[PDB]
Design a protein around this ligand. Structure first.
Ligand SMILES: CCC1=C[C@@H]2Cc3c(c(N)c4ccc(Cl)cc4[n+]3C)[C@H](C1)C2
Ligand SMILES: CCC1=C[C@@H]2Cc3c(c(N)c4ccc(Cl)cc4[n+]3C)[C@H](C1)C2
Ligand SMILES: *[C@@H]1O[C@H](CO)[C@@H](O)[C@H](O)[C@H]1NC(C)=O
Ligand SMILES: *[C@@H]1O[C@H](CO)[C@@H](O)[C@H](O)[C@H]1NC(C)=O
Ligand SMILES: *[C@@H]1O[C@H](CO)[C@@H](O)[C@H](O)[C@H]1NC(C)=O
Ligand SMILES: *[C@@H]1O[C@H](CO)[C@@H](O)[C@H](O)[C@H]1NC(C)=O
Ligand SMILES: *[C@@H]1O[C@H](CO)[C@@H](O)[C@H](O)[C@H]1NC(C)=O
Ligand SMILES: *[C@@H]1O[C@H](CO)[C@@H](O)[C@H](O)[C@H]1NC(C)=O
Ligand SMILES: [Cl-]
Ligand SMILES: [Cl-]
Ligand SMILES: [Cl-]
Ligand SMILES: [Cl-]
Lengths: 532, 532
């Protein structure tokens, strides 16, 4: 009854789950698309055909096929991001947590996982929607979408592998929420999409894309934005990477149809095993199969859409973490280690700059180096390490997001900007990595509220604060409760450019988030690279 | 007897001058060249023909023909630099201060005045040699040389106006000292040349030029070095400026001979009146007629000579002032005034940047701006003012000199580097100008020892310290007296790059003078400008 819901495509039976000292309803693994398998690999998704009988929605679904990280086998800090369910191309499912008793018509929040467009799962422990749904009385949906070549192989002009199909997977889940969430007590007119990393970029892409704009009300972007340098490629570059994927697999390259036919015969792990081989440069924070600027999902270049105001005009809430780069340096740059302070030699610093800005000419590399080197103390291994950390984070996350923030706010209806700089007391990664990419997620999803996870009481309060900001913004377009006496998170405005720190200390308002480095990344360096 | 000296060119009769509570001998206005007048304008100097009788050397000579500054008529702070004697092309004379009684064979210091190669006089009150000669028991010579077009008109290929003849004037005075100073009690094997601004560049140029190297022992450079962007031009640019000088005066431009003949028939003031018209750009800290890289006085490019060690290997002592740029901004940049704090708007800041780096493309201007702009506070008029001050001083004086210092020290026999940052208690210029270009000269020449000038006791102590460093270096190649208990001024080395502050406080040693900005000026910006 409470667990038995009739949707437009058939009946679903959820399950009653414990949350803290209470319970809520969970509907796990509801299908929203036809399985994109066989001849449907690389194709746009098709709506799930209606079923008879009762869909058993008591169990998490499979995860999409993806690279699995084996750098630190058994280490919780890396394993927590890997698929925790069987991988399958049959992976287009969504999950819903519903407060008990079922509300009449409440705010909906739809989580879009990140992972560089090459990885990610809706089913990770850290994306468990039950604490947020319970604590804030929202209906929490987590969707899924194809990643890697399966979601983003792009042979523009082919209707068999057009590109962006992972984004269309997301849109079809949004369409399903629009059509069905009312049966779960959600208001389809008050849907907030939120996501981190590639999920944050995705959220921004749905803001931009005309075919997505009417399927949600407002948006939250965490450590990602649509204009990030890793988040899209041109149709020519997508085509080059798809041809090179076939070349790595001894495919007939004479035509799109012959190439696609070859790739559809391969087993999924055969594609994944060569996925990284198509990148044009030795690099970090670059991923092979990503959204393509196609003229269809994206009518024009992202920058022109941003400049002209060709995007959904609504409220947004978004921000970044203090040390976005450390994860990527640990995994891809010389001199970094999980088990040392990772003091970086001058030689390894220069190597890291080249890996971090792979598209830069020698003059551009000199500019980055000069901008981040203290020439009174150039052999300081801590300064070299932290300088590289800032380079990676500023170039790939912080400054792209600030460009988006500044462009969006000219036309939008409300911007709230945050800077998350709390390092968790129980973090398993070493201190040099600081406030790591993605480690705000556990606070957004309320994991500090769980006694057995050993967060401090101050971190529980911060998580409660963040969840309330997020859900109140989702409900009202404003993270602040009116007539409350706590300090107010101010609108980011073009003139004053205010943001807040998110940490365990009382809220502080600042202005011009990393403005000095972002003038370098957003204006001077692009002009230098264009001119040379 | 003491005042009657027979030189190789004839007899001279000096005068006995009071100095503090004692007396010394002065030989003023001794000719060292034939008057460069008539058909000898623009020509290399010729040695002064010997004279019969006794040359009356009791009176300062004429000053060379030059632009006279009328910006602040009657204001001591600017008038103190203007000619204080009649101007004439008949101006190639030198002055000698000799301790009394005459020493047997003592250290010689030869002062070379600055003034952008367009101005300067040996007779300024601030260059009065009597305090240094008396206090430190040296023979103090001040030479003169043709400035402006008269000294540096350059039509390469012509023997009538070859260029660099002002440097040859200096050389001929050095040759005269070599041949004659023994008759005044000076040791021709222990001559130190020292100079400020264009005089400091000149000193470095004699270090470089093979024809000058054997005419002095060691060298002091104050706020000037031979590689300064204002201190030389190419043969092509020198020719262009000479032809443009003729165009401004309705001259026949068909040939060097006709152009030169036209220019030789003009009154001196006619040349001076159009001197600034030949500069290629609106600019500050740029001067029309300067040394030319000719292949003779300078066998190859200054940079190749520095790189190869093609220069005199000896000891050098050199340094800069804290606020080298303020004089040039006051006189040439919008928003600066003698009678106000000169807070600079963003608009006037950008205007000043273009005036300060006139040769830079737009990308180069952006680089300079970004490097000197605090984008958290870009409308701060004080920061904008001081940022421009730093731009002018760093680009034109400090970083060229640090490049010279580093190249020289690889081959030289001892480098001593200073940073003069004491603002005189009795300065007549406003406080925003700080420690002005040229305002260390009055300390080098011992003016604070004159009670009537109202320096503090601490400034008298600083002047005496500086005079003793300069003269002890002149005598020994080391500003420090061994066996002494004074703090020691350390050698500048390639590895440690130490320098001292010169001020009224106890000595501080620092390393890497303005290294961050000078990497920008000496490595990055030239590379940006060469790419584009
Ligand atoms: C690569 C993109 C990516 C983004 C998200 C965040 C993320 C992921 C990881 N596997 C990580 C593995 C090690 C470390 Cl220290 C951080 C990670 N983090 C922060 C996945 C993959 C999800
Ligand atoms: C322009 C070159 C130049 C360098 C020397 C120092 C100098 C000179 C001036 N006329 C100055 C006029 C005003 C001020 Cl505030 C400073 C000046 N200072 C510092 C002459 C001319 C000699
Ligand atoms: C749904 O699946 C779970 C486990 O897969 C099972 O325990 C439950 O009984 C199922 N519901 C049915 C079969 O109605
Ligand atoms: C949002 O839009 C409404 C309706 O036009 C307007 O009244 C309000 O001022 C806007 N708020 C912001 C922050 O732009
Ligand atoms: C959390 O703390 C409890 C109680 O002190 C301890 O038993 C447990 O091992 C801790 N959990 C983790 C994951 O460290
Ligand atoms: C030399 O000139 C000075 C200054 O005018 C004068 O006092 C002196 O009498 C002159 N000497 C002779 C011998 O004329
Ligand atoms: C200067 O040269 C002398 C003689 O060759 C040498 O002994 C001395 O080490 C040199 N000093 C410096 C500071 O280079
Ligand atoms: C020096 O200071 C005294 C006392 O302040 C003053 O009388 C005198 O005029 C000053 N000298 C000059 C040259 O200004
Ligand atoms: Cl079924
Ligand atoms: Cl850190
Ligand atoms: Cl605004
Ligand atoms: Cl100042």
């Amino acid at each position: 009854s409470e667990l038995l819901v009739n949707t437009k495509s058939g009946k679903v039976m959820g399950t009653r789950v414990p949350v803290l000292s209470s319970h809520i309803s969970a509907f796990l693994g509801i299908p929203f698309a036809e399985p994109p398998v066989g001849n449907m690999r690389f194709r746009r998704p098709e709506p799930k055909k209606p079923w008879s009988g009762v869909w058993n929605a008591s169990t998490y679904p499979n995860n999409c096929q993806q690279y699995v990280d084996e750098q630190f086998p058994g280490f919780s800090g890396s394993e927590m991001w890997n698929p925790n369910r069987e991988m399958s191309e049959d992976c287009l499912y969504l999950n819903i947590w519903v407060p008990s008793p079922r509300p009449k018509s409440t705010t909906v929040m739809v989580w879009i996982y990140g992972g560089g467009f090459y990885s990610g799962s809706s089913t990770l422990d850290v994306y468990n929607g039950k604490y947020l749904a319970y604590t804030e009385e929202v209906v929490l949906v987590s969707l899924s979408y194809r990643v890697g070549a399966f979601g983003f192989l792009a042979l523009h002009g082919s209707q068999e592998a057009p590109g962006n199909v992972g984004l269309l997977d997301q849109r079809m889940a949004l369409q399903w929420v629009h059509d069905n969430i009312q049966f779960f007590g959600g208001d389809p007119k008050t849907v907030t999409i939120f996501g981190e990393s590639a999920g944050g970029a995705s959220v921004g892409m749905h803001i931009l894309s005309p075919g997505s704009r009417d399927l949600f009300r407002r948006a939250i972007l965490q450590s990602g934005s649509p204009n990030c340098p890793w988040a899209s490629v041109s149709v020519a570059e997508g085509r080059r990477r798809a041809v090179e994927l076939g070349r790595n697999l001894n495919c007939n390259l004479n035509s799109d149809e012959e190439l696609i036919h070859c790739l559809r015969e391969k087993k999924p792990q055969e594609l994944i095993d060569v996925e990284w081989n198509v990148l044009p440069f030795d690099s970090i924070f670059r991923f092979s199969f990503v959204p393509v600027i196609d003229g269809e999902f994206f009518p024009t270049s992202l920058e022109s859409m941003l400049n002209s105001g060709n995007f959904k005009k609504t409220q947004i809430l978004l921000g970044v973490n203090k040390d976005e780069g450390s994860f990527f340096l640990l995994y891809g740059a010389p001199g970094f280690s999980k088990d040392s302070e990772s003091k970086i030699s001058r030689e390894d610093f220069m190597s890291g700059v080249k890996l971090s800005v792979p598209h830069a000419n020698d003059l551009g590399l000199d500019a980055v180096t000069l901008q981040y080197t203290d020439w009174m103390d150039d052999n300081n291994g801590i300064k070299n390490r932290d300088g590289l950390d800032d380079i990676v984070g500023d170039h790939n996350v912080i400054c792209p997001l600030m460009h988006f923030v500044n462009k969006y706010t000219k036309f939008g209806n409300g911007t709230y900007l945050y800077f998350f700089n709390h390092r968790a007391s129980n973090l398993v990664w070493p201190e040099w990595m600081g406030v790591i990419h993605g480690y705000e997620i556990e606070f957004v999803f309320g994991l500090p509220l769980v006694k057995e996870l050993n967060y401090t009481a101050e971190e529980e309060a911060l998580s409660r604060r963040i969840m309330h900001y997020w859900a109140t913004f989702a409900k009202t377009g404003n993270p602040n409760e009116p007539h409350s006496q706590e300090s107010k998170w101010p609108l980011f405005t073009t003139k004053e450019q205010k943001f807040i720190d998110l940490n365990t200390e009382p809220m502080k308002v600042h202005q011009r988030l990393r403005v000095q480095m972002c003038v370098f990344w957003n204006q001077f360096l692009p002009k230098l690279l264009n001119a040379t």
